[PDB]
Design a protein around this ligand. Sequence first.
Ligand SMILES: CCS(=O)(=O)c1ccc(CNC(=O)N2CC3(CCCC3)c3nc(-c4c(OC)ncnc4C4CC4)ccc32)cc1
Ligand code: NA
Length: 259
Amino acid sequence: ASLTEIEHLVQSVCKSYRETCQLRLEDLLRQRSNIFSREEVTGYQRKSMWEMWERCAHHLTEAIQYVVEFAKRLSGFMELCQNDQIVLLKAGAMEVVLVRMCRAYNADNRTVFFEGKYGGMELFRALGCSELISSIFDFSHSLSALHFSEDEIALYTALVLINAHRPGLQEKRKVEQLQYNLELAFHHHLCKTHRQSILAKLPPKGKLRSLCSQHVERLQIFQHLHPIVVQAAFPPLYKELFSGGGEKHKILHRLLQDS
Ligand SMILES: CCS(=O)(=O)c1ccc(CNC(=O)N2CC3(CCCC3)c3nc(-c4c(OC)ncnc4C4CC4)ccc32)cc1
Ligand code: NA
């Protein structure tokens, strides 16, 4: 590579993110004052466990859809073979959402954006997975302290997804080359903006893997309680990425084909 080529990659990644960020940061901050009432928290707590799981599975899917769109728009992703594209999204799309989540987290009152308003851990008690919720919250709290810029998230999420270590990749060297360019792009931006300090403060890759495995773990617990609910009321893309053996229907495949 060259210095010019690397700077072009920074802007290409940032553009790709701006176009696929789901909600604009400005729209998220303006809403921080809009918080659920005590009666509205009771309302969420009074809802059934299956209803809460269904609503949560639907929002995770919508967030994943934008992460798929980000991958398609990512420099060098569509050039990779179909197998590697799918391995990279199956293993990383969930992790990209988990990072993007801190944008909708307010560390001041310990609230997250959910269905038009801001709520705390209490709003998700009906789910019956208080450990996963607390984990998502602490992880969001941790990244909030870093005070990420939209460009920084754009470049970091690009690397999260483009990982050569992912098990099952056919063209490892091709991903190793893509990762190396994105590494440089990210490090160049951080160097230019005097933000090299956050590198040590970044969460270890093992923590992202832990939260993903924790989701699947609590999902199978819920699946054993309401199998017909996962079968009839859960999104097809969610089922493929997390439910076993819901991997039968290939939704990601069609998502990548068109455009
Ligand atoms: C993402 C791009 S963005 O533009 O910044 C953006 C856009 C929309 C929203 C709305 N909220 C939302 O989607 N929410 C809220 C919360 C956070 C914590 C509690 C509930 C949650 N959680 C999950 C989630 C999981 O998030 C990664 N991981 C595992 N399980 C779950 C489900 C609770 C079972 C999945 C969506 C989800 C927020 C942010
Ligand atoms: Na934040």
